[PDB]
Amino acid sequence: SDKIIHLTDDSFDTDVLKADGAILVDFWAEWCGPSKMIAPILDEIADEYQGKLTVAKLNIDQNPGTAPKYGIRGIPTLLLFKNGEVAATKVGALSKGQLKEFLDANLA
Amino acid sequence: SDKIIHLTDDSFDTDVLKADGAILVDFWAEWCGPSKMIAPILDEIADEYQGKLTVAKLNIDQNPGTAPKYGIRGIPTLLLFKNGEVAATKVGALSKGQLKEFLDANLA
Amino acid sequence: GTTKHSKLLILGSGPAGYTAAVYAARANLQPVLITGMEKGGQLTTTTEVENWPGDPNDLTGPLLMERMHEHATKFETEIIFDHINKVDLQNRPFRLNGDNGEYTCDALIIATGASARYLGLPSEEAFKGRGVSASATCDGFFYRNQKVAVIGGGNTAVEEALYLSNIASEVHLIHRRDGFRAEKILIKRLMDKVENGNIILHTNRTLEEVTGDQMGVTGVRLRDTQNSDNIESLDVAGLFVAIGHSPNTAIFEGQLELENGYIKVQSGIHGNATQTSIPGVFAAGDVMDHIYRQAITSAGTGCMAALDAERYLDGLADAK
Amino acid sequence: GTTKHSKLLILGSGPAGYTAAVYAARANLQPVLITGMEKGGQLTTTTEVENWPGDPNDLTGPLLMERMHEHATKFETEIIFDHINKVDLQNRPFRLNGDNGEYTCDALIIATGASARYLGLPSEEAFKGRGVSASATCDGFFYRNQKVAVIGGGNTAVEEALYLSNIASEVHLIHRRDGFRAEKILIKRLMDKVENGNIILHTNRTLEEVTGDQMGVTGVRLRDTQNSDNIESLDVAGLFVAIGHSPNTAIFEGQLELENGYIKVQSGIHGNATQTSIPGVFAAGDVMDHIYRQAITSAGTGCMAALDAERYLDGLADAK
Ligand SMILES: Cc1cc2nc3c(=O)[nH]c(=O)nc-3n(C[C@H](O)[C@H](O)[C@H](O)COP(=O)(O)OP(=O)(O)OC[C@H]3O[C@@H](n4cnc5c(N)ncnc54)[C@H](O)[C@@H]3O)c2cc1C
Ligand SMILES: Cc1cc2nc3c(=O)[nH]c(=O)nc-3n(C[C@H](O)[C@H](O)[C@H](O)COP(=O)(O)OP(=O)(O)OC[C@H]3O[C@@H](n4cnc5c(N)ncnc54)[C@H](O)[C@@H]3O)c2cc1C
Ligand SMILES: Nc1ccc[n+]([C@@H]2O[C@H](COP(=O)(O)OP(=O)(O)OC[C@H]3O[C@@H](n4cnc5c(N)ncnc54)[C@H](OP(=O)(O)O)[C@@H]3O)[C@@H](O)[C@H]2O)c1
Ligand SMILES: Nc1ccc[n+]([C@@H]2O[C@H](COP(=O)(O)OP(=O)(O)OC[C@H]3O[C@@H](n4cnc5c(N)ncnc54)[C@H](OP(=O)(O)O)[C@@H]3O)[C@@H](O)[C@H]2O)c1
Structure with missing residues (x-):
């Protein structure tokens, strides 16, 4: 809630694809429950990872372009970028601990 | 639905108390389930007991003036009249056999 | 001299009976349900209901049962207004007599609830x-x-x-x-x-x-x-x-194991939990529960009665 | 340092849990409920729901569950978005460990359901x-x-x-x-x-x-x-x-008597039917049902759990 970005198909190439640093991407959709279930976790994460990561949500419900580009045929799917480069991805719902396990595994 | 006399507070004595013959009076209300659960059985009684009995439904939702008159502090309550004369009375719900077992034990 | 047969006959129009109904209907069991004198069940004698999970506001016993009824007929359940006052569970098909005829069924779900x-x-x-x-x-x-x-x-x-x-x-x-x-x-x-x-x-x-x-x-x-x-x-x-309230089991007197008025059921965590002492005869709702007695618990066992009877009727169709 | 304690704690935000939530909340047990990662339960992964008694048309899992969340919170249930990773059922108060903190409770209702x-x-x-x-x-x-x-x-x-x-x-x-x-x-x-x-x-x-x-x-x-x-x-x-699916009973490995993954309960027609192997610990929902597994049966048991929990907690208060 202090770094989250309502990313769009336009402001992506510039935001994620080209920005030194790790920006996590939570692909969601108003129709997929577990999708929006991760948003809260991202916020509880926003602070603890503020300086190593920037949580950025993306609504394919109104932003198609993006998803296909990376072959994402499932939601929610998380993409951990590093200098506009998919470095790691996690699929499906998960707990704050499984997500911190994921970030600490790569992002460090 | 065509024999059961849907009485009215005013037109009561002018119906049940004066008109000769054994006429059964059903005091009911749209708020008392058991009251409206009798409606069916009364039909299969107006027919199954025709000529030897008359059925009259005195709803009280909007006809309170009559109930008091006989000391009816509870519905549904059935009063078996005989020209302004209570011959019998049946307080409470009941099945078809129930009602008939009362109509027979009484009527002659 | 009008007798009526049905694979499945449900006794009761309370939440237990009606839930057993929608489940049996969706199993294309063509269920016949007898309402009983108190159509809708006990919930019809109350006003606001506050503990029916999912209906946090303005729910009323009458409305809930109005909805359950609608729901049982949606899947073409056959609701007959009648009361049962005698039954023979000793011979198949089963014999139940009411104020409108004789009833026979290959399986019976008893959901007679209880009386004040x-x-x-x-x-x-x-x-x-x-x-x-x-x-x-x-x-x-x-x-x-x-x-x-x-x-x-x-x-x-x-x-x-x-x-x-x-x-x-x-x-x-x-x-x-x-x-x-x-x-x-x-x-x-x-x-x-x-x-x-x-x-x-x-x-x-x-x-x-x-x-x-x-x-x-x-x-x-x-x-x-x-x-x-x-x-x-x-x-x-x-x-x-x-x-x-006392459980409605006088008609089932001396017809199946009764424990202090409540119909005894197998129970257990191995399925067929709603089966009475007589195969093919199942009980749900307050007639078989003297501890909990809730609208929601009755809806549950009612659901179980259906699934149990279907599993039972399936068997009979295989020997055929 | 700030371990959240409560008389009763419910695990799971599915139909079973939420029902236990509301029934327990009315017994004034000031219930604490942990949602889990799948807040709302399996039902949230479906669309139309055609057999939730009393909802003949257009009902959807998401809707039914959003409604139950509202219901459980209406009676002041402390709903906490968390997931339990470890549990200690050998020491009273029971110790439960989750990503957002540590919890202890005098009675536990396990409504963890199952995973795909x-x-x-x-x-x-x-x-x-x-x-x-x-x-x-x-x-x-x-x-x-x-x-x-x-x-x-x-x-x-x-x-x-x-x-x-x-x-x-x-x-x-x-x-x-x-x-x-x-x-x-x-x-x-x-x-x-x-x-x-x-x-x-x-x-x-x-x-x-x-x-x-x-x-x-x-x-x-x-x-x-x-x-x-x-x-x-x-x-x-x-x-x-x-x-x-398979019951989510992993976090309970070797602390509760399990049977093919499912938590074993007393069952029976004498109350305390949701009693697990450890007194004071109860299970409701699919996590303890290998047979029926419907939303209506889960809500039913979640109810018995809350009631059994109260019967238990009261017993503790009594014998004091
Ligand atoms: C005033 C009041 C308020 C209540 N409020 C709540 C509440 O807020 N929440 C809650 O969870 N629970 C509440 N309950 C309890 C709840 O009503 C019962 O646990 C539940 O409805 C029982 O369901 P059932 O289907 O087993 O039986 P019942 O609802 O008793 O239904 C029995 C059915 O069987 C029929 N029947 C009986 N005998 C025969 C026969 N011989 N032949 C044919 N049909 C027969 C009846 O006509 C009826 O349709 C309330 C009860 C009362 C009395
Ligand atoms: C697509 C689909 C459709 C369905 N449709 C229907 C239908 O139409 N009708 C019907 O009657 N039934 C339906 N069901 C079945 C029904 O969903 C289940 O019977 C029911 O949800 C069981 O309820 P429950 O509360 O026991 O468990 P669940 O609903 O599975 O919920 C379990 C809860 O436990 C939580 N949890 C798990 N582990 C932990 C932990 N370690 N820490 C914290 N929280 C934890 C989860 O977050 C979840 O909230 C469907 C199932 C699926 C998959
Ligand atoms: N929300 C709601 C509203 C009404 C009913 N219900 C449920 O439906 C079921 C039946 O409820 P109910 O209230 O009609 O009946 P129940 O919960 O069994 O309570 C009955 C109450 O009546 C008392 N009682 C019984 N026989 C009596 C007698 N001969 N003389 C005097 N009192 C008598 C009885 O006394 P106690 O056992 O405490 O000494 C007791 O206080 C329960 O499972 C309820 O929780 C839920
Ligand atoms: N309305 C609705 C919608 C969805 C689920 N539900 C209920 O929720 C519960 C679970 O339903 P569910 O459909 O997810 O699962 P369930 O009813 O348990 O049925 C499982 C189905 O999957 C099959 N199966 C299981 N293991 C398999 C394996 N290893 N490989 C291949 N197939 C396998 C299984 O085969 P079968 O035994 O028939 O030969 C069967 O076909 C049930 O109790 C349902 O009644 C209700």
């Missing part, structure tokens, strides 16, 4: 319809702005005093224990009124007699549960007995 | 997220006018097949047998669509492997159950596995 208890006093019976009532829902308005009395200590008793308290000038709650078994949240609303409102407690008392004249009840006489010889009068215009 | 089951094929894993999916309601979007597969013969498969049917160009239902276990009413909808719709039946076949490239799943290989080596190839855009 009674005190068994001649004064109590002598004043019905004239002061002694069974439903505040029905007669409550005959006591507006008058002294009224309730007797019981469970959720009904309490919900009745709470309900009546907004009608009668004052409510007198009579009960044996010094404590109530009604849900906590409710006892609080109760006590709040016993304090700032018009509800008056009469703990440790037992109704000895309903007194009155040739026009209706005018008072009630209580007895002490501690001092056997101490007694007290109570000027009251009406009495509502709410001392529980 | 998988085959165990690495190809299945390799493509999860790129063609292999568990929820159609979530990913059916990615298959507009494309061929897609479903594997399983239960209600979930059929419904997903039926649902996918109006999204994909063609649906291929794969199953280990010639027979389906889903409700008839549904099996009928299936065939009726198999006969003149876009659903293709692939009976007596089992998922042997999922094929594809960096861009996702391109097809699958079924096996044929009646000819060990008849392996056939099927060109498809993605597949949804629907082969049942």
Whole structure:
């Protein structure tokens, strides 16, 4: 809630694809429950990872372009970028601990 | 639905108390389930007991003036009249056999 | 001489019966359900329902059952208005007689629920319809702005005093224990009124007699549960007995294992939990539950009765 | 340092838990409920729900569950978004460990439900997220006018097949047998669509492997159950596995008597029916039901759990 970005198909190439640093991407959709279930976790994460990561949500419900580009045929799917480069991805719902396990595994 | 006399507070004595013959009076209300659960059985009684009995439904939702008159502090309550004369009375719900077992034990 | 056969026959139109109905219907079992004299079940004798998971507001026993009924017929359940007063479970198909015919079924789901208890006093019976009532829902308005009395200590008793308290000038709650078994949240609303409102407690008392004249009840006489010889009068215009319910199993008397009136069922965590002592005969709802007795628990076992009967009827179709 | 303590704690935000939540909240047990990662339960992964008694039309899992959340919070249930990783049931108060903090409670209601089951094929894993999916309601979007597969013969498969049917160009239902276990009413909808719709039946076949490239799943290989080596190839855009579930009882390893994954309860027609192996610990919902597993049965048991918990907690207060 202090770094989250309502990313769009336009402001992506510039935001994620080209920005030194790790920006996590939570692909969601108003129709997929577990999708929006991760948003809260991202916020509880926003602070603890503020300086190593920037949580950025993306609504394919109104932003198609993006998803296909990376072959994402499932939601929610998380993409951990590093200098506009998919470095790691996690699929499906998960707990704050499984997500911190994921970030600490790569992002460090 | 065509024999059961849907009485009215005013037109009561002018119906049940004066008109000769054994006429059964059903005091009911749209708020008392058991009251409206009798409606069916009364039909299969107006027919199954025709000529030897008359059925009259005195709803009280909007006809309170009559109930008091006989000391009816509870519905549904059935009063078996005989020209302004209570011959019998049946307080409470009941099945078809129930009602008939009362109509027979009484009527002659 | 009209006899009716059906693979599946459901006895009861309460939440248990109706849930067994929608499940059986969706199993294309073509179920026939007999409503019983109290169509809708007990929930029809109450007002607001607050514990039916998913309906947090404005739900009423009547409305819920209006919805369940609609729901049972959506999948073409055959609802017949009738009461059953005799059954032969010793021979197949099963024999059930009502005020409209003979019924035969290859499987039977019993969901007859329970009926309001009674005190068994001649004064109590002598004043019905004239002061002694069974439903505040029905007669409550005959006591507006008058002294009224309730007797019981469970959720009904309490919900009745709470309900009546907004009608009668004052409510007198009579009960044996010094404590109530009604849900906590409710006892609080109760006590709040016993304090700032018009509800008056009469703990440790037992109704000895309903007194009155040739026009209706005018008072009630209580007895002490501690001092056997101490007694007290109570000027009251009406009495509502709410001392529980007894399971509807007289017709099944000597037809299947009954334990204190409640139909005994296999239970267990190995399926076929709603099966009575007679194969093909299942029980659900309050008729087979003397502990919980809730709308939601009854809906559940009702669902189980269906799944159990289907699993049973499937077997018969395979031997065919 | 700030371990949150409570008389009762409920695990799970599904129908079973939320019902226990509200019944326990009314017994004024000031319940604390932990949602889990799948807040709302399995029902949240479905669309229409046709057998929730009293909801004849247009009801959807999400809706029913959003309604239960509201209901449980209405009676002041402390709902906490968290997931329990470890539990200690040998020391009272019981110790439960979650990602957002540590919890202790005098009584516990385990309503952890179950998770989607998988085959165990690495190809299945390799493509999860790129063609292999568990929820159609979530990913059916990615298959507009494309061929897609479903594997399983239960209600979930059929419904997903039926649902996918109006999204994909063609649906291929794969199953280990010639027979389906889903409700008839549904099996009928299936065939009726198999006969003149876009659903293709692939009976007596089992998922042997999922094929594809960096861009996702391109097809699958079924096996044929009646000819060990008849392996056939099927060109498809993605597949949804629907082969049942398994109770979420891992965090309870060797602390509660389990039976094929499911938590064992006393059951029986004498109360304390949801009592687990450890006094003061109860289980309701699919986590303790290997048979019926419906939303209505889960809500039923969640209720008994709350009531059993109260009977227990009161006992503690009494014997003090
Ligand atoms: C005033 C009151 C308020 C209540 N409030 C709540 C509440 O807020 N929440 C809650 O969870 N629970 C509440 N309950 C309890 C709840 O009503 C029951 O646990 C539940 O409805 C029982 O369901 P059932 O289907 O088993 O039986 P019932 O509802 O009793 O239904 C039995 C059915 O069987 C039929 N029947 C009986 N005998 C025969 C026969 N011989 N032949 C044919 N048909 C027959 C009847 O006509 C009826 O349709 C309340 C009860 C009362 C009395
Ligand atoms: C697509 C689909 C459709 C369905 N449709 C229907 C239908 O139409 N009708 C019907 O009657 N039934 C239906 N069901 C079945 C029904 O969903 C289950 O019977 C029911 O939800 C069981 O309820 P439950 O509360 O026991 O468990 P669940 O609903 O599975 O919920 C379990 C809860 O436990 C939580 N949890 C798990 N582990 C932990 C932990 N370690 N820490 C914290 N929280 C934890 C989860 O977050 C979740 O909230 C369907 C199932 C599926 C998959
Ligand atoms: N919300 C709601 C509202 C009404 C009913 N229900 C449920 O439906 C079921 C039945 O409720 P109910 O209230 O009608 O009946 P129940 O909960 O069994 O309570 C009955 C109450 O009546 C008392 N009682 C019984 N027989 C009596 C007699 N012969 N003389 C005097 N009192 C008598 C009884 O006394 P106690 O056992 O405490 O000493 C008790 O206080 C329960 O499972 C309720 O929780 C839920
Ligand atoms: N309305 C609705 C919608 C979905 C689920 N539900 C209920 O929720 C519960 C679970 O339903 P579900 O469909 O997810 O799972 P369930 O009813 O348990 O049925 C499972 C289906 O998957 C099959 N299966 C299981 N393991 C498999 C394996 N390893 N490989 C291949 N197939 C496998 C299984 O085959 P079968 O035994 O018939 O030969 C069966 O076809 C049930 O109790 C349902 O009644 C209701």
